[PDB]
Design an enzyme around this catalytic site. Sequence first.
Site, PDB file in Angstrom:
ATOM      1  N   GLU A  35       0.814  -1.225   0.000  1.00 50.44           N
ATOM      2  CA  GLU A  35       0.000   0.000   0.000  1.00 50.44           C
ATOM      3  C   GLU A  35       0.842   1.268   0.000  1.00 50.44           C
ATOM      4  O   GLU A  35       0.458   2.248  -0.613  1.00 50.44           O
ATOM      5  CB  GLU A  35      -0.965   0.024   1.189  1.00 50.44           C
ATOM      6  N   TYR A 118      -6.044   6.887   3.962  1.00 50.74           N
ATOM      7  CA  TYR A 118      -6.164   5.834   2.964  1.00 50.74           C
ATOM      8  C   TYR A 118      -5.552   4.518   3.422  1.00 50.74           C
ATOM      9  O   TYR A 118      -6.179   3.467   3.322  1.00 50.74           O
ATOM     10  CB  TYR A 118      -5.508   6.230   1.641  1.00 50.74           C
ATOM     11  N   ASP A 136      -8.785   6.036  -2.517  1.00 54.62           N
ATOM     12  CA  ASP A 136      -7.621   6.487  -3.274  1.00 54.62           C
ATOM     13  C   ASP A 136      -8.155   7.222  -4.507  1.00 54.62           C
ATOM     14  O   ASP A 136      -9.352   7.466  -4.596  1.00 54.62           O
ATOM     15  CB  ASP A 136      -6.754   5.285  -3.679  1.00 54.62           C
TER      16      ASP A 136
END
Length: 344
Positions: A35, A118, A136
Amino acid sequence: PAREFQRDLLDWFARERRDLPWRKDRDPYKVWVSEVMLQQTRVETVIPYFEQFIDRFPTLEALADADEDEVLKAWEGLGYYSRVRNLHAAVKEVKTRYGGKVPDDPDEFSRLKGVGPYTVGAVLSLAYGVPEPAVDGNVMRVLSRLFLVTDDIAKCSTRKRFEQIVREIMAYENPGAFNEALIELGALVCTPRRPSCLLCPVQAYCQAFAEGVAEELPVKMVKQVPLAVAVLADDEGRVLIRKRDSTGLLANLWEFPSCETDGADGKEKLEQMVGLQVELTEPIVSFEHAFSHLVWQLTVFPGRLVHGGPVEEPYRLAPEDELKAYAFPVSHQRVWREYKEWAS
DNA sequence: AAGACGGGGAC
DNA sequence: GTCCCAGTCT
Ligand code: SF4
Ligand SMILES: [Ca+2]
């Protein structure tokens, strides 16, 4: 129409989801690393880096115990280097403070460096099943089209609007899959340009499609800088390189001595930089390098190096065959390429 | 809020 | 050239 919308989204996802490296398992560490790498970087670009990185740092502990220098080198070429400085610090934090376990609480995980709204959602939902949104650019584009949101998505507060929308329609029974499906939809179907609305699994629910404005959504609102670089070669075959300031542009990366000419002086403002002295010559080649908020107009300047004192300060002497051991920005990587292409 | 913070690959 | 990618921090 939340429940039905969920069924279609999730059904599509099961059939169309890409078998990416970080999707082999749901290991908190592996998910988190991926991520952070995916932040403002394309999947195609990440894949090679994720593979190398995980091999070199298989566990959170292994990464924690690594010297920052090796960690940056593993990130060389990815961009936005503070991401890895923060991930390293955060991983060291989880080892000592949380016994090597990635916190499963949003308030806890969100205090770690590099972890913004996020990442909290992506990592916790996927790895722990926590019902937090993971919005996102992909999700923002998707939601903006589905609910016909015309607010500038560049506005800090527009993301909050999207997060609330997700909290209302997400499958609280399988948040991880739900979040991932939303992102995948944006990556494969509901694309920036020419989305594939005719093949979209949630077309029926889309206000942008019904109104025929899918392609106009989402709504969304640099300075030049000359630089002189110096490549000093020691008759012994060793070169001079310095480590960069710990805060700011390309922080903690290595580079060839250089200065913001801020005009056209060249081999002048450079020589002065001694704080171990010498003179230069004439350029060897000139190119440009773009970032996101500014561009570099760098011009190289070679020269010879004669020893007259100890190498201290940020500076560090290093043999030519050892350079591939340090982490260099893409700009300076080219500088060296043009140098050996010259003495060729 | 709005600017800092890399590098790259479609169009 | 332009856009923007699985964003975060100050
Ligand atoms: S129908 Fe088109 S605009 Fe609407 S979500 Fe699907 S691809 Fe996106
Ligand atoms: Ca945070």
